[PDB]
Symmetry: D2
C-alpha cells in the first residue's frame, strides 16, 4: 500500500510517497508566508508532484504540523494565518483523499519508533531538543494523542517549581530549562551580550567555566525529565533527537546520561538512544500516520 506524507514546517514543506518502509519520492518547496489558502495550495501541489515523481498515487495523506492540533475541527491551533485554518477539509477537497493530521514531534516519534532508533520496540518515548522541547509517546506503535490533542507535551512537565518563565504560561518546564532558546536566554543573560547556541558551545569547548555550568545544568534537567517520564510510561526505549541535543559537545551527552541513570536508581532503566532519522523524521512520521490509519481502518 502507498500513501503521501506531508511535513509542513515553518520554512519548508516536504512531501513524499511512502510505501510502508521507504520514501519513493521526496519534494521540498519553501513554505508560503502568504497565508492559509496558499499554504494549502502548496501542500496539495507538493503532494501531486511527489506522486508524479514516484509514478504512484497515494490512497491517503498524512500531514505533520508544527503546531498543536484540534483533531475534531481538523485545524491547526512562523506561518501567517494558518491559525484556525480548516486545513484537513480543504486538503481533502483539493486532493480527493482522506487527510490524517499529526503534530510534528509526535510524527518524528512515530518515525523513530517504526523506522529509526526504536525499531523493534512495542513502546517508546521520544524527546526532541531544538529551539523548543517537544516529544511524543508511542504505545504499541501508535501515537498517544490525548483526549484533547495535548498528549505527549513532554517539554512542559514541571521539573523546577519556581523556575524560569515558560512560553506556555507556566515556569520550570523542561523546555524553559533546557531548550536551545533557554540556553541562549541564560547565556545572553549571564555573559551580558547576545550568545546563541553556537557561541555557547564554542565557549563550552574552550573550557569557559560559566558556559560549562550552564550547559551541564541543562543536560542534567533533560536526563532528569526523561527518567521521570520512565516512571509514567515505562517505554521499551527512550530516543533523544533534535539538533540542539544531537550536535551538543560530548560533555553534554555524558552529563545527560549520567543524570538519567542517577534518577533511575532503584528502577529498571530503558535504553536511551540517539534519534537516527535526522531531518526526514517528520516527513516519515506524517506518512506513517496515514499508512497506519489506513492499515487499522
Amino acid at each position: 500500500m502507498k500513501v503521501v506524507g506531508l511535513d509542513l514546517g515553518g520554512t519548508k514543506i516536504a512531501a513524499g510517497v511512502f510505501d510502508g518502509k521507504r520514501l519513493l519520492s521526496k519534494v521540498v518547496v519553501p513554505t508560503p508566508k502568504e497565508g492559509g489558502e496558499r499554504v494549502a495550495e502548496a501542500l496539495a501541489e507538493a503532494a501531486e508532484r511527489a506522486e508524479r515523481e514516484a509514478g504512484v498515487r497515494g490512497e491517503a495523506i498524512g500531514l505533520g504540523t508544527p503546531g498543536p492540533l484540534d483533531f475534531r475541527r481538523g485545524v491547526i491551533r512562523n506561518i501567517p494565518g494558518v491559525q484556525d485554518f480548516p486545513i484537513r477539509r480543504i486538503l481533502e477537497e483539493a486532493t480527493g483523499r482522506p487527510v490524517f493530521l499529526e503534530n510534528d514531534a509526535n510524527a518524528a516519534a512515530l518515525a523513530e519508533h517504526h523506522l529509526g532508533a526504536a525499531q523493534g520496540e512495542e513502546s517508546s518515548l521520544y524527546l526532541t531538543v531544538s529551539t523548543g522541547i517537544g516529544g511524543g509517546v508511542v504505545l504499541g506503535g501508535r501515537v498517544l494523542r490525548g483526549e484533547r490533542g495535548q498528549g505527549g507535551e513532554l517539554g512542559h512537565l514541571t521539573l523546577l517549581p519556581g523556575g524560569p518563565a515558560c512560553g506556555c504560561g507556566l515556569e520550570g518546564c523542561l523546555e524553559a530549562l533546557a531548550a536551545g532558546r533557554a540556553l541562549e536566554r541564560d547565556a545572553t543573560y549571564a555573559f551580558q551580550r547576545p550568545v546563541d547556541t553556537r557561541e555557547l558551545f564554542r565557549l563550552f569547548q574552550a573550557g569557559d567555566p560559566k558556559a560549562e555550568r550552564l550547559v551541564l545544568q541543562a543536560a542534567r534537567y533533560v536526563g532528569i525529565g526523561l527518567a521521570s517520564l520512565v516512571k509514567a510510561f515505562d517505554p521499551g526505549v527512550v530516543v533523544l533527537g533534535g539538533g540542539v541535543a544531537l550536535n551538543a559537545p560530548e560533555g553534554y551527552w555524558e552529563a545527560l546520561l549520567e543524570a538519567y541513570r542517577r534518577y533511575l536508581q532503584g528502577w529498571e532503566a530503558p535504553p536511551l538512544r540517539r534519534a537516527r532519522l535526522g531531518a526526514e523524521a517528520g516527513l516519515l512520521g506524517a506518512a506513517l500516520t496515514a499508512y497506519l490509519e489506513v492499515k487499522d481502518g
Copy 2:
C-alpha cells in the same frame, strides 16, 4: 460473562463474583500470617466461597495486590509474610482451574474508577491515590497502561523537587516523598519534635496551628502540581484523586490542591479533577475488571 475478583491486602482478603458491572457476592477473610502457601489457599477458598454465595462460577480470576508485580513471571516481588518472590499466579491457576490475571492495587483502583466510578464515560483517565504512600494508574481507552516492564503508571515517583527529601524508591523529591501520608508524618514529627501522625497533624491544621498549615498546604500544592504535570504527558479525559489521606484531609487541603492544579494548567485545557467514588471496594472491583476485560479482549 462472570469472573471472580480478589483483592489481597496486608490485613484482609476480599473476594467477589463480578458480572462486568456489579459484584454478585462479597467475602472478606483475614490474610494469613503463615506464608505464601497458606495465603494462596486462603485466596482459592475465598474465591470458592464467593462463587457459592453468588451461585455462579467465574471463568477467570483477577487478583489485585499491593506489591511491585513481576507480570512476566506472575509473582509478587510488604505487610504480608514470605509472599516474597512468591509465584501466586500459577499456584492460583492450579488450585482453581481458572486463568488468573494479576494487577497492581493502584492500577486496579484506577481501572475501577474509570469504568464504574468518578471517570465513568471517559476513554482515558488518570488516577492518583494518596494514602500511606502515593500510587496511581493510567487508563487509556478503558485498559491499564502497564509499561514494557510493569513500571508504567508509577505516578508517585515522578520527580517534582530535585534536591528534595529522600524517597523509599531510591530517589529524592518524588511526589510520594513530598506528599504521601508517611511524608506528612515524617515532616510533622521532625518539625514538631514529637511523634505526629496524620490524625494529629490534621487536628493541628483545623485548630489553625501555623506550622501544621504550612506543611499540609505545601503537600497539597505538590499533589496539584504533579497532577497538572501528568496532564501534559497524558492529556486524560478526567483526573481522579483518591486514597484515605487525600479524601479525609481538611477542606483547606482540597482547595489548595485544586488551586495549584489550576495554576499549573494556565495556558492549557484543564481536565476535570474529581474525587474517587468507589472507596474501599475500588481494588476488588478493579481486580475483577482486570479479569473481565482480559476475557472480553481475549
Copy 3:
C-alpha cells in the same frame, strides 16, 4: 566639620558639600566619555564647584562608584576606560584632601542608615533592585567591608539551586531571579519578543497572566532573600530601594512583603521599610563615608 561627597555614575557625576546632616550644595555634571584622565578631572572640578557653590571647603572627599573596586589600592578595577584607574591617588594629588572610596550600593545603605529609612537604628540591611541587585550591611552604622571587600554582596546569595545562570558565575542568585535584567530576560523568553521592564509592568497592570506570574515570582524571591538574610544579621530594620522595586506596579510590593512575612513565621520580623532618599542616596553615602572616616 565639612566634607565633599562624590557619586560617580555612568551618565552623570554628583558632588556636594556635606556638613554631617545636610547637603550645603549639590552639583550634577555629565560623566566624561574621554577616559579616566578626564573623569578624574571632572570629579575634581565638580568637587571645587560644590565647595564654591556652598561657600566652604571640605576636609575630606568621599567617592562612590558601581565598579568592582580594590580598597587597599584605591583603584576602580559602564564608563570608557577606567580599567584599573588609581582614582584615589589621582584625586588626592589633584585635590589636596584625603579620598575615601565606597561601593555605590554600600554608600546608599549608609545614607539610608544615617539619613533615611533606617535613621535611629544601630544596624540595618539594605537591598537595591535595579538593573542588577546590590546590597549593603551597616553595623552600627558603618559599612561591613568584608575581609576581601566582598562584604554585602546581597544579590548573590543562592536562593534557588539549579536556577537561572547569574552574571557572577553561579546560578539561582537573588540577582539572577529578581533583578530588572532578570525580569527582562524571562519576559523576553516567555513572550517570545523583546520585553523591557516598562512593557512587562504595562502587561502586569493590564492583567496579563504570564506577566503576573513572572513579576509575583520575582517579588516573592526578594521577600525570601531578605527574610533569609535576617537570620544571619538580625538587623534593626531592612531597607528596600531601587527603581525596579520601588516603581513596580501595586501588587509587587504586597507579594514581596507577604513572602518576607511568611519566611519569618516563628521569628521576630524586623520592619521592612521603603528607601526614602531616592536619587541622592549614593551622593549622601559617599559624603557620609568621608564624614565618618574623618571623625574616627
Copy 4:
C-alpha cells in the same frame, strides 16, 4: 586577668577558670534535671569549685547556654539567671548563646586563631553557628544574630523546627539526616546506622548523605557573599565524625558555589567539646576588656 567560664548544657555543666590563654581548672557536674533555681545554685557551686581547684578568683563570669537569649533582661526558661548568679557569686556575669560561644572560641583559640573575622557553623543534632567580626560575636538587634542554620536554601523544602521550610538545618542537621534515612529505609535509622550504611556503600545512604553535605557547602558559600569572612570554620560531631566522602562533597559544593568569587579557607573546628566552655570564658574575658 582571670575569669570563670560556665557551659550550661542539657546533660552536664562545665566550669573552668580562664586566664586569657588556657583553662587553669575544669569541672564537669551533671545538670539538675529538676528545678531552675537549683541549676542556678549548681552554676555558682561549679564556679567556686573551679576557683578552688585553680586557686584563683575570677573578675567576671561568662555563661554559655543553648537557648535563644534575651540580653537586656538577662534571661533564657524566662529565669533571671544573670541577676541571680550575679547575687549568688558577687561578680559581673555575661551571657552568650552556645554556638556563638564556640564560634568565638574557634576564632580566638581554635581554627581561625589570627583572623580578624570568621564564620562558624556547627552541624550536630541541629545546625547552629556564629559570626565573629573583629574578634567579637555579632549578636544582632534582638540577639537573633548568626542563626545560620535557618538560612533558606530550598524553598518548598522540608518543614523546619523553626516554623519555616528548606532551612539549612531542615536539610542537613543530624535530626534531618535521621528523619530522611528513617523515612527512605522505612525503619528507625540514626546517624550511626546511616553512616555505617554509607561506608558499606548503600546507594540510598550515599545519595542522602552527599545531598546534605552539598547543602552545607552551598549555605556556607552563600554566607560568604553576605559576610566575606577571613575564614569559615565547620564543626559539630555530625560534620566532624562523618565519612570522608561527606567532607569532600561539602568542599566541592562550597568551591562550586564560589566560582567567580574569592573563596575563604574552610577549616575544621579544633577545640572539640571544650569550645563552648572556652567561648563562655572568652565572652567574660573580652567584655571585661
